[PDB]
Design a protein around this ligand. Structure first.
Ligand code: FES
Ligand SMILES: [Mg+2]
Lengths: 96, 220, 135, 86, 99, 111
């Protein structure tokens, strides 16, 4: 009938759905190095998702892993292990 | 008097396009002036959907075919009113085009109100201006929205006072009470200039044709 | 004494009804013109509503088959260095030239999308277009 | 009409009314075109079209308004709130 | 053989352009107020950029410049609003002057 | 109204001639200062407020500037900005804005 009329399709220009840094990666309570990347260096508090930039599922995984490691003796509770203070910062917190 | 009126006022009402307004524009001219660009899909108004061709990347596209038909009707109405010597008042609160619209009104011999529409200009006209004042016979809205994205109160007041309203309605406007809506882009300078030129040309053609017909009748 | 009930009917209907009733002795100047050339819709006030349930606006997004080619081009080569000139009605971007070449190559009878993409890129290089890949 | 004085209120109301005239279609110039059941706020009005000579069997206010409109024959029952303005 | 609205829309440069994000367009300064340059770039709206500190005098009415668009219109919905608030202007970055 | 002011001016001319005759001065070279002096002499008022004192001035000075009717017999107003309700003020603003646009395109003594 008419070829210039718009066609029914999806959005070919759709930008990729942003993926959390941990998407597709296995959060384990033994990976204390990864877990310490989401705990405050000074108080040991677990950062919120507004700081970690994690999806809900990965935030819950991180929290459960941190608690399990802390109670199983893999991770300090009140502070970040000093061995990991110099790891790639991935948290949107600026104390100074 | 009877024959004069019969052949002057009622003669043009027997022709589909007595003033030949269709030649004043084409869908290509409207496109070149960008009459087809609306606001984002979020600003869309529920009553402007019938005139929206679609949504190009969340940007509404106004159906220029419907715009052409509506613009034909609006220009024909405006030409007939100017021919009948009615008062045509151009309303627009777009400060970017206030000066232009005032100049167009002055040039075409009609009136303009591009300033803060004080309450009662139309509903309280007899008290404000005088008991014998003559209200506009047609109101042409170059921007049916005020400066806070609400419909111009003149639209409601004109509907109240039974003054027909031509009006350029964007995708975020409310054409319900505008007698002759012209779906189009009221924010681009090109589109506003095209609308001003079209209405000016139609009104001038109507007035000059009125003079010519009067001369033809009175010379015989 | 024109009725000031802008929510009840249209100006035409109210004027006509009052003239019929005899309230208005003379038809207003615009009545004959309106009756001769009425608008496509009678301007009756309607209160707007917000759609609530499964109802959605009937506006359909304007897509074309070449939009896929344009998206692939922008994802592979980026915007480019030739800035758009939207004032010229006949302006053609590098993406549009790629789209035309892809379309004619498809008309030639090639179906493979990646082969069409690479062939079009090479053809544009031959024509003298600096298709700079973003990655 | 609102006024500190009753006569000023009357004048205001009756002068404002003439600028807000409805036009009512009357069937054969004596009644309504069909039965009308409506609810305005909490007032229900059930009006029945009636033959010639039936009279106005309506709330007294409806009788007054119908005599003004030009309706001679109609039945009307007002249920719910009898608020005069509604 | 008269081009229809469908044909015009399909072949228009704006339609040929995809999303207006990070697209280099050619604007034209049509109005200047202090260091604010109002630039029209073929969209429905204009972009109000700031006179670059370098070559500032070179930016005058009618000058044709290069912009990197970020959004044809600046609109967004806010808590409780029924319709998008729009600032009636595009978003773009002024990359310099076209010569 | 204009006819009223014209009649007032005729009355003032006749009365000025009469006052000149009364004071014996030349009607031709009788000025407004002379009229004021003659009236002050003939109708001595000690009222402190000068405006409350007797005055025989030109109707132009006496009556306030009355705005003329702003439309013709056909009903059409004269000024295209009439319906603003402030046609003169907005005409002045429009002219100033036009001058400013032209200027932008091209390029202890008073208060
Ligand atoms: S972003 Fe993929 S699981 Fe969170
Ligand atoms: Mg608009």
């Amino acid at each position: 009938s008419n070829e210039d009329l718009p066609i029914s399709m999806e959005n070919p220009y759709k930008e990729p759905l942003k993926k959390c840094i941990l998407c597709g990666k296995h959060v384990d309570y033994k990976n204390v190095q990864l877990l310490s990347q989401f705990v405050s260096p000074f108080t040991g508090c677990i950062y919120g998702r507004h700081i970690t930039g994690l999806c809900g599922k990965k935030q819950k995984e991180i929290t459960k892993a941190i608690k399990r490691a802390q109670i199983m003796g893999f991770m300090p509770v009140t502070y970040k292990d000093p061995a990991y203070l110099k790891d790639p910062k991935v948290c949107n917190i600026r104390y100074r | 008097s009877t024959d004069f009126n019969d052949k002057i006022l009622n003669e043009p009402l027997k022709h589909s396009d007595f003033f030949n307004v269709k030649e004043l524009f084409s869908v290509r001219s409207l496109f070149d002036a960008r009459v087809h660009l609306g606001h984002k899909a979020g600003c869309r108004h529920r009553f402007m959907e019938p005139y929206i061709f679609g949504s190009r990347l969340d940007h509404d596209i106004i159906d220029l075919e419907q715009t052409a038909t509506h613009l034909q009707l609006a220009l024909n109405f405006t030409a007939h009113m100017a021919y009948r010597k009615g008062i045509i008042l151009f309303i627009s609160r777009n400060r970017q085009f206030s000066y232009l619209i005032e100049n167009m009104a002055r040039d075409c011999g009609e009136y303009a109100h591009t300033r803060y529409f004080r309450g009662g200009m139309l509903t309280n006209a007899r008290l404000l201006f005088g008991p014998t004042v003559r209200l506009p016979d047609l109101i042409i809205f170059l921007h049916t929205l005020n400066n806070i994205f609400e419909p111009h109160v003149a639209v409601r007041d004109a509907a109240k006072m039974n003054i027909p309203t031509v009006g350029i309605v964007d995708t975020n406007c409310n054409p319900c009470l505008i007698t002759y809506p012209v779906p189009g882009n009221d924010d681009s300078p090109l589109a506003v200039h095209l609308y001003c030129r079209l209405f000016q040309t139609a009104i001038t053609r109507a007035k000059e044709k009125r003079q010519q017909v009067e001369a033809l009748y009175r010379l015989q | 004494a024109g009725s000031r009930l802008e929510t009840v009917g249209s100006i035409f209907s109210r004027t006509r009804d009052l003239v019929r009733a005899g309230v208005l002795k003379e038809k207003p100047l615009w009545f004959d013109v309106y009756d001769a050339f009425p608008p496509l819709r009678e301007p009756v006030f309607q209160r707007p509503r917000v759609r609530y349930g499964k109802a959605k606006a009937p506006i359909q997004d304007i897509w074309y088959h070449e939009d896929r080619i344009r998206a692939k081009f922008y994802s592979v080569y980026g915007s480019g260095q030739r800035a758009f000139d939207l004032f010229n009605p006949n302006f053609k971007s590098t993406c549009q030239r790629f789209v035309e070449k892809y379309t004619e190559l498809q008309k030639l009878g090639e179906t493979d999308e990646e082969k069409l993409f690479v062939e079009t890129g090479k053809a544009l290089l031959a024509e003298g277009v600096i298709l700079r890949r973003v990655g | 009409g609102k006024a500190t004085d009753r006569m000023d209120a009357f004048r205001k109301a009756k002068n404002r009314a003439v600028h807000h005239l409805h036009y009512i279609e009357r069937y054969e110039d004596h009644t309504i075109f069909h039965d009308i059941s409506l609810r305005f706020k909490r007032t229900h009005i059930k009006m029945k079209k009636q033959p010639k000579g039936y009279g106005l069997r309506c709330h007294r206010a409806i009788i007054t308004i119908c005599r003004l409109i030009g309706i001679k024959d109609m039945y009307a029952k007002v249920s719910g709130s009898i608020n005069m303005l509604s | 053989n008269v081009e229809s609205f469908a044909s015009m829309l399909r072949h228009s440069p704006l339609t040929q352009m995809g999303p207006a994000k990070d697209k280099l367009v050619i604007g034209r300064i049509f109005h200047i107020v202090e260091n604010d340059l109002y630039i029209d770039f073929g969209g429905k709206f204009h972009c109000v950029c700031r006179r670059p500190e370098v070559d500032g005098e070179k930016y005058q009415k009618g000058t044709r410049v290069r912009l990197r668009l970020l959004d044809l219109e600046l609109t967004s919905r806010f808590l409780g609003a029924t319709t998008d608030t729009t600032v009636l202007e595009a978003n773009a970055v002024l990359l310099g002057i076209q010569e | 109204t204009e006819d009223f002011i014209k009649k007032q001016i005729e009355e003032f001319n006749i009365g000025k001639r009469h006052l000149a005759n009364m004071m014996g001065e030349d009607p031709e070279t009788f000025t407004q200062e002379d009229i004021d002096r003659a009236i002050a002499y003939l109708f001595p008022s000690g009222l402190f407020e000068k405006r409350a004192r007797p005055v025989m001035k030109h109707p132009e000075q006496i009556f306030p500037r009355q705005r003329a009717i702003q439309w013709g017999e056909d009903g059409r107003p004269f000024h295209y900005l009439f319906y603003t309700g402030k046609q003169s003020y907005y005409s002045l603003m429009h002219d100033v804005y036009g001058m400013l646009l032209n200027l932008e395109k091209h390029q202890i003594g008073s208060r």
